[PDB]
Amino acid sequence: SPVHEQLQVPQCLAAKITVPHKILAENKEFKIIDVLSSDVETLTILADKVSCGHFVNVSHKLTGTLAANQQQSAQKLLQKKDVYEIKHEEEVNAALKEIVSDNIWQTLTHMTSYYNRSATKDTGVDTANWLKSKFEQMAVEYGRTDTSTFFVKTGWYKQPSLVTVIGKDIKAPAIVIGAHMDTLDGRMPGAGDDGSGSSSIMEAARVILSSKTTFKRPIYFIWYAAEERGLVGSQHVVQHFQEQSIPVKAVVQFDMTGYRNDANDPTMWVFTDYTDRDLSNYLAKLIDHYIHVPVDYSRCGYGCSDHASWNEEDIPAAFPCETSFADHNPYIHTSSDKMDLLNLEHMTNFSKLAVAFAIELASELE
């Protein structure tokens, strides 16, 4: 009766695991382990202190067709030219002026008022419904007629991922902007992680929705479910896109957009592992050109956030973040991850970055 899940874990982290678990398979860099669903969260907290990477939930990949067991499936898992330019300055600059910082603060206020937004809880489902209806309200408010919304289910997890699209009938490789809506169990305001990213892209979506521009690509805004369970929701979303043959040009992930290590240092960080090099380089250019704050670089290890799900399928993916890995918000995944830690100018800048990304890339066709 108790649910088991299977996780892919870097060796540096797996060596320090004390909760009960079976090892299904192992190579130089990874173990794949079997744990109780109820123990997964302690692993997240351990991963935070070990700081050598997180994990990926591979439960769904082990039930894949043309396979016998789990241990044999686990062993097979562990075995063995796009140009980006800045060409829409006038349009991007006008759009950036439309961003309303108070909207981000108010969205964030609502999200943190749930006890938590865990993928196994009804409040996790409420969050998804609330985001969906907010998107739909805004589309009506600004008379944008080419939008659509739908849920992507998350297996036995209650909370679905939310997929929204602007330009639903445009047949061209899509631009994707993402964040995750969930938190851990217990009291988890999840303001920094990832209420801030969720709120930043919601306001970016508002600005695109108020636009009268016809783009050359569809633009997706996605709030993934169950990121904290090991990227479960983004894995289902990527699978949905593959099954439905929806081509994707470029993906950006917003996971934590509000914490400044130094309140007067507005530096934005570009993460360089499990991301596309050219697209990451493009993000730095966007920040420099449109946001006019410094750029620095960091790495955050395996299973870091939902961009990794896209990157694993060789889809160009990038990840800007509020801090370096070394200086990250220390109250992450605790009840102290609150709005009072955060900087609204920082969050607004990430929201501006989402809009520039969307406009620049969706306005061009290869």
Rounded to a whole number of angstroms, the minimum distance from the CB of residue 331 to Zn ion is 11
At closest approach, how far in Å is the CB of 190 from Zn ion?
Answer: 8
The response to whether 136 counts as a known ligand-binding position is: no
Give catalytic status of residue 21 as yes or no.
no
Residue 34 or 193 with smaller CB distance to Zn ion: 193
Q: Is 227 annotated as a binding residue?
A: yes
3 state DSSP class of 128: helix
Instruction: Say whether 54 counts as a known binding-site residue.
Output: no
238 exposure class (CB count in 10 Å sphere: 0-12, 13-18, 19+): buried
Edge to edge, what strands does the sheet with 219-224 contain?
147-154, 157-166, 219-224, 174-180, 248-253, 317-318
Q: For this structure, is 255 an active site residue?
A: yes
- Residue 167 or 192: which CB sits closer to Zn ion? 192
Which member of 193, 194, 306, 337 is catalytic? 193
- Residue 176 CA: distances (Å) to CA of 91, 122, 192, 323, 361: 19, 27, 21, 22, 10
Q: Is 4 annotated as a binding residue?
A: no
Answer yes or no: is 333 a known binding residue: yes
Instruction: Spot the catalytic one: 54, 328, 333, 346.
Output: 333
Q: Which is nearer to Zn ion, 217 or 333 (CB)?
A: 333
Parallel/antiparallel/unpaired status of strands 22-26 and 30-36: antiparallel
The helix, strand and coil proportions of the chain, stated in percent and rounded to the nearest 5, come to 40, 20, 40
Burial class (CB in 10 A: 0-12, 13-18, 19+), 258: buried
SS3 category, 342: coil
What angle in degrees, to the nearest 10, is found between the helix axes of 344-362 and 101-111?
A: 110
Of 34, 182, 194, 227, the catalytic one is 227
Could you confirm whether 180 is annotated as catalytic? yes
The whole-angstrom separation of Cα 76 and Cα 61 is 11
180 is in an annotated binding site: yes
Rounded to a whole number of angstroms, the minimum distance from the CB of residue 173 to Zn ion is: 26
**Are 189 and 195 spatial neighbours (Cβ–Cβ below 8 Å)?**
yes
CB of 349 to Zn ion, least distance (A): 18
- Identity of the residue, 142 or 325, whose beta carbon is nearer to Zn ion in the bound complex: 325
Contact 207, 99 (CB under 8 A): yes
User: 196-209 and 101-111 are packed helices; what angle lies between their axes, rounded to 10 degrees?
Assistant: 130
- Kindly tell me which of 194 and 322 has the beta carbon lying closer to Zn ion: 194
89 classed as catalytic: no
Check if the beta carbon of residue 255 is closer than 8 Å to that of residue 194: yes
- Pick the catalytic residue from 21, 54, 88, 180: 180
Residues forming contacts to Zn ion in the complex (CB under 5 A) are 193-194, 255
Binding residues: 180, 193, 227-228, 255, 333
Catalytic amino acids? Answer: 180, 193, 227-228, 255, 333
Binding site listing for Zn(2+):
180, 193, 227-228, 255, 333
